[PDB]
Design a protein around this ligand. Structure first.
Ligand SMILES: *[C@@H]1O[C@H](CO)[C@@H](O[C@@H]2O[C@H](CO)[C@@H](O[C@@H]3O[C@H](CO)[C@@H](O)[C@H](O)[C@@H]3O)[C@H](O)[C@H]2NC(C)=O)[C@H](O)[C@H]1NC(C)=O
Ligand code: NAG
Ligand code: CL
Ligand code: CL
Ligand code: ZN
Lengths: 7, 582
């Protein structure tokens, strides 16, 4: 699907 | 029997592939173009995907998962039994979907304005202010402003969001949403494991914290920094004080060993968002790993739009469930930080391409931390002074300690923050923290874990967690903590796979086919096997371990202890109740 960052 | 099980899995995979692809298109259209029209379509497509989830999920629950022979088929059907939000009754589901979209839109369009003047957006404007300003009050303006405009606006949605996500979790057999989220790791001792890892990294964090606090004391004045207290949260070069690398100039161990300004170098030498992603692509292919397809460059949004349209700026990578269509959406700025972010996102894309031949139900990381870690591993090698010099972006023992400090400001500072976020959330989900205690408990954890305090007292109506993307976006955060531990484990293993000897922090895995092959075999597994198998294939062992990260920073730990002891620093924050008198 969708994957982000610290992020 | 086993025949009916594999038939069901095949039908599920065929139909999911089509419907998830449709949803992704609608999701992308909203994310890259926030309007009433695209919002409406996304909400309608949510209902479509839920009818598919309900249909197959209901059928999946008729199977006794533990009476099945095949372990691949077992893992799929078990997962399909979990309907997620589609477990909710129709009207609650539409309410939930609307709440999510409202939170996301609210966060994405929020601005902080000068009265009768310019309005600043989080990216790039407020990010730049937090990174570059060395003026206490200007930093406070941005910090407080963002929480006043984004944080406070999210509060009206959050209690109902919590109620609905917990309800969905309970209807799927979990006790709350936090339970549901933690289960993605399939690790019964997860909490204990995470706590021990956090504990092991305390000496390093407390030493870094004390050193930085002293440097801040020198710059911002004795009246504004308590050497035995928590650090005001707006002084660390980052909106959330989650990474501290932007205050490097204030803390550099050896100013007599200066380093090139990386941003100016990139800007002068004509680096662009496109070239930044190309360099990441080049690193991946150097390891013998897969290049991104031609379509990636055609369809991706690698910079903020200039036609005035609203977008979700937060960097993300997109799998369209087609085996062909992969995209990055990022509001890229030409600097070193975003080059690191570019590698991170490209790590996601690589993972997509590696497992594209698996059943769609298994197209995920070994655990969510694995998906986050891949790009970061390569970025660790990119970050070496050796490699940055080869890119013409930088030009001995002093430089070595300087570099380790620079890396600790991102990597070490992030450990307590990435731990804290979901510590707060799990307790909200489990009912330990109520809506009356949201903010007070957030700052209790901010103090306990990070040793930070708010620069200004918090008032009734404040919801500072709302000012962090992943809270309104409902994206689990513990994955980033896991990522930061395991990426060093991956680094250590790939470095000895590449034959490198000497200090771990000097390792550059560029062009190593042996390192690429190890990452590849693990990535190809997707979610088909328990994560310790993927951990074993990369590292030669099955555990999460802080050892590699400790080894990486060993020379810095020694130097920090020496420096802190000679300056007479109190490690930690004994005067924990201190806040700015300002
Ligand atoms: C349980 O069911 C799964 C899925 O139906 C079976 O996994 C499949 O096993 C075959 C080998 O027997 C895999 O073939 C492999 O991939 C390529 C292309 O098919 C082939 O050229 C290689 O030589 C290699 O053998 C196939 O990929 C794999 N499918 C999945 C989805 O993982 C598994 O065999 C069953 N387990 C038992 C114990 O019966
Ligand atoms: C943006 O949304 C509009 C509808 O307002 C739509 O017609 C258009 O295709 C979308 N994309 C861009 C780049 O404007
Ligand atoms: Cl905050
Ligand atoms: Cl997670
Ligand atoms: Zn990510």
């Amino acid at each position: 699907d969708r994957v982000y960052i610290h992020p | 029997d086993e025949a009916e099980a594999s038939k069901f899995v095949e039908e599920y995979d065929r139909t999911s592939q089509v419907v998830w692809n449709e949803y992704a298109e609608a999701n992308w259209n909203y994310n890259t173009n926030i309007t009433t029209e695209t919002s409406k379509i996304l909400l309608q497509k949510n209902m479509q995907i839920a009818n598919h989830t309900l249909k197959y999920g209901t059928q999946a629950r008729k199977f006794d998962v533990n009476q099945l022979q095949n372990t691949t088929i077992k893992r799929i059907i078990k997962k399909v039994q979990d309907l997620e939000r589609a477990a909710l009754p129709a009207q609650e589901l539409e309410e939930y979907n609307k709440i999510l979209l409202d939170m996301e839109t609210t966060y994405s369009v929020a601005t902080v304005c000068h009265p009768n003047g310019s309005c600043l957006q989080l990216e790039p404007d407020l990010t730049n202010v937090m990174a570059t300003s060395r003026k206490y009050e200007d930093l406070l303006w941005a910090w407080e402003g963002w929480r006043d405009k984004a944080g406070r606006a999210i509060l009206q949605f959050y209690p109902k969001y919590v109620e609905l996500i917990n309800q969905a979790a309970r209807l799927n057999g979990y006790v709350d949403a936090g339970d549901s989220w933690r289960s993605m790791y399939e690790t019964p001792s997860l909490e204990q494991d995470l706590e021990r890892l956090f504990q092991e990294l305390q000496p390093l964090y407390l030493n870094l914290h004390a050193y930085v606090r002293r440097a801040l004391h020198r710059h911002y004045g004795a009246q504004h920094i308590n050497l035995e207290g928590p650090i005001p949260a707006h002084l660390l070069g980052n909106m959330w004080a989650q990474t501290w690398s932007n205050i490097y100039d204030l803390v550099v161990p050896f100013p007599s060993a200066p380093s090139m300004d990386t941003t100016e170098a990139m800007l002068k030498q004509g680096w662009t968002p496109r070239r930044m992603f190309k360099e990441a692509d080049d690193f991946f292919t150097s390891l013998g790993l897969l290049p991104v397809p031609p379509e990636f460059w055609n369809k991706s949004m690698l910079e903020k739009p200039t036609d005035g349209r609203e977008v979700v700026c937060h960097a993300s990578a997109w799998d369209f469930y087609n085996g062909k269509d992969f995209r990055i959406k990022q509001c890229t700025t030409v600097n070193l930080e975003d080059l690191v972010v570019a590698h991170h996102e490209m790590g996601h894309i690589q993972y997509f391409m590696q497992y594209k031949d698996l059943p769609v139900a298994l197209r995920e990381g070994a655990n969510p931390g694995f998906h986050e870690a891949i790009g970061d591993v390569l970025a660790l090698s990119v970050s070496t002074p050796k490699h940055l010099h080869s890119l013409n972006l930088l030009s001995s023992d002093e430089h070595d300690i300087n570099f380790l400090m620079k890396m600790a400001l991102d990597k070490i500072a992030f450990i307590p923050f990435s731990y804290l976020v979901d510590q707060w959330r799990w307790r909200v989900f489990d009912g330990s923290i109520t809506k009356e205690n949201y903010n007070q408990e957030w700052w209790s954890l901010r103090l306990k874990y990070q040793g930070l305090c708010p620069p200004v007292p918090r008032t009734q109506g404040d919801f500072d967690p709302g000012a962090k993307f992943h809270i309104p976006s409902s994206v689990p955060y513990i994955r980033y903590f896991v990522s930061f531990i395991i990426q060093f484990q991956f680094h250590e293993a790939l470095c000895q796979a590449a034959g490198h000897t000497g200090p771990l922090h000097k390792c550059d895995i560029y062009q190593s086919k042996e390192a690429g092959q190890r990452l590849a075999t693990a990535m190809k597994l997707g979610f088909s096997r328990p994560w310790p198998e993927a951990m074993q294939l990369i590292t030669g062992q099955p555990n999460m371990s802080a050892s590699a990260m400790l080894s990486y920073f060993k020379p810095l730990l020694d130097w920090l202890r020496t420096e802190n002891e000679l300056h007479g620093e109190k490690l930690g924050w004994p005067q924990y109740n201190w806040t700015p008198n300002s």
